[PDB]
Swiss-Prot record:
Residue sites binding GTP per the record: 18-23, 142-145, 177-179
Record: residues binding Mg(2+) 2: 18, 43
Binding site for Zn(2+): 58, 61, 73, 76
Name under which the protein is recorded: Translation initiation factor 2 subunit gamma
Quaternary organization: Heterotrimer composed of an alpha, a beta and a gamma chain.
Pfam families in the record: eIF2_C (PF09173), GTP_EFTU (PF00009)
UniProt similarity note: Belongs to the TRAFAC class translation factor GTPase superfamily. Classic translation factor GTPase family. EIF2G subfamily.
Domain tr-type G residue range list: 6-199
Organism: Saccharolobus solfataricus (strain ATCC 35092 / DSM 1617 / JCM 11322 / P2)
Keywords: GTP-binding, Hydrolase, Initiation factor, Magnesium, Metal-binding, Nucleotide-binding, Protein biosynthesis, Zinc
Domain of life per record: Archaea
Gene this protein is translated from: eif2g
Cofactor(s) listed in the protein's UniProt record: Mg(2+)
EC number annotated for this UniProt entry: 3.6.5.3
Chain segments carrying region G4: 142-145
Length: 408
């Protein structure tokens, strides 16, 4: 039989075509993931469509057809059980995209074969991928069945030529039709070869990125049957177990009269869940639901969005001022034209995304490789050289202008 495991990897899927990405995930998993007729499964998405699937392989069948997402090889003429490879999860495509982005172990960038390459959205998405550090990439040429072999091949060469000078020079290009299911087994193969499961040091301190929180107690719930608040997020390192003492950072915003501060919120894990399966422990990969003993007022309606969770005794600096070793883009994708990126300037306001968090800050110091920033809200910095996305409001819209590492 195949094992019931948690996903071990998150793969972001970002695309121009909007009946693209969802149909793509569906082409992999086989099931419709738009209006899941069971909100009884808490909440895990933040309006980010999410899906899990097993991946396996019939060793004796020709690849790529040998790849299956189910424990049957009848499709390649065997009654034997395919080898189970792994369970993967997908995250379907400003603060919100950043938050989704924090969780991807890899990505698939989808382009429409019946559209000139590159579409505006395509280049935007590409830049975005470069900024967030997700370099495990696959480009999918979707809807290749509505253009000829020749047109698809032409666009393939254009994309390769486009990538030839960049870091994405060797990213594979995989033609598929998500809607009509053509050549899907090749993409699963591609996901296996090019979006490998990252190294996990499971001795590392447990860290979870929190991306949702909800009060799951339904109306009419009797008071004595109330469950504690639930925190949904993505574990980015280490592992958590039920009954471990943990804390939420920055935690609770507390106002003493004429004062403001954040005090970490301590609680205990009551339950760990991936989809509709319960687990005894939770590791990186997939979206996890974490039961707590928290007052649901604390989790009600994503109150805790952007927080992180660590063990209670974890030592994690919560900082209102941060130093960032940064790198800016040469220029920015715009409606009409590429836009020159002015160097950082003191007293200007930037947006910094750290993990699943997004906070406004004032620049207090500017050097060539480093800036210092005063934050409107504090950040939990769980490790040195955490990546940050630096954004500036340009033309009345927030745009990612570079990235950096917070240095402690």
């Amino acid at each position: 039989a195949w094992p019931k495991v948690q996903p071990e990897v998150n793969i972001g899927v970002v695309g121009h075509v909007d009946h693209g990405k969802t149909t793509l995930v569906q082409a992999i998993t086989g099931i419709w993931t738009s209006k899941h007729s069971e909100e009884l499964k808490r909440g895990m998405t933040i309006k980010l469509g999410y899906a899990e699937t097993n991946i396996g392989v019939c060793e004796s069948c020709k690849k790529p057809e040998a790849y299956v997402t189910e424990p049957s090889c009848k499709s390649c003429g065997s009654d034997d059980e395919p080898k189970f490879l792994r369970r993967i999860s997908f995250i379907d495509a400003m603060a919100t995209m950043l938050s989704g982005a924090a969780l991807m172990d890899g990505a698939i960038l989808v382009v429409a074969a019946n559209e000139p390459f590159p579409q505006p959205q395509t280049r935007e998405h590409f830049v975005a991928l470069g900024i967030i550090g997700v370099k495990n990439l696959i480009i999918v040429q979707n809807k290749v069945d509505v253009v000829s072999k020749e047109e698809a091949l032409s666009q393939y060469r254009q994309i390769k030529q486009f990538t030839k000078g960049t870091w994405a020079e060797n990213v594979p290009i995989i033609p598929v039709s998500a809607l009509h299911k053509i050549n899907i087994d090749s993409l699963i193969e591609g996901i296996e070869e090019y979006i490998k499961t990252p190294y996990r040091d499971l001795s590392q301190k447990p860290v979870m990125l929190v991306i949702r929180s909800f009060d799951v107690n339904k109306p009419g719930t009797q008071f004595n049957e109330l469950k504690g608040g639930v925190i949904g997020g993505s574990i980015i390192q280490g592992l958590f177990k039920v009954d471990q003492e943990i804390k939420v950072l920055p935690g609770l915003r507390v106002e003493k009269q004429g004062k403001v501060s954040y005090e970490p919120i301590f609680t205990k894990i009551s339950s760990i869940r991936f989809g509709d399966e319960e687990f005894k422990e939770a590791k990186p990969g997939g979206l996890v639901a974490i039961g707590t003993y928290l007052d649901p007022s604390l989790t009600k309606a994503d109150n805790l969005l952007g927080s992180i969770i660590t063990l209670a005794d974890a030592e994690v600096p919560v900082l209102w001022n941060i130093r960032i070793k940064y790198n800016l883009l040469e220029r920015v994708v715009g409606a009409k034209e590429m836009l020159k990126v002015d160097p950082i300037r003191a007293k200007e306001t930037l947006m910094l995304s750290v993990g699943s968090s997004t906070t406004l800050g004032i620049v207090t110091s500017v050097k060539k490789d480093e800036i210092e920033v005063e934050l409107r809200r504090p950040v939990a910095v769980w490790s040195n050289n955490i990546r940050t996305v630096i954004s500036r409001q340009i033309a009345g819209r927030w745009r990612m202008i570079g990235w950096g590492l917070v240095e402690i």
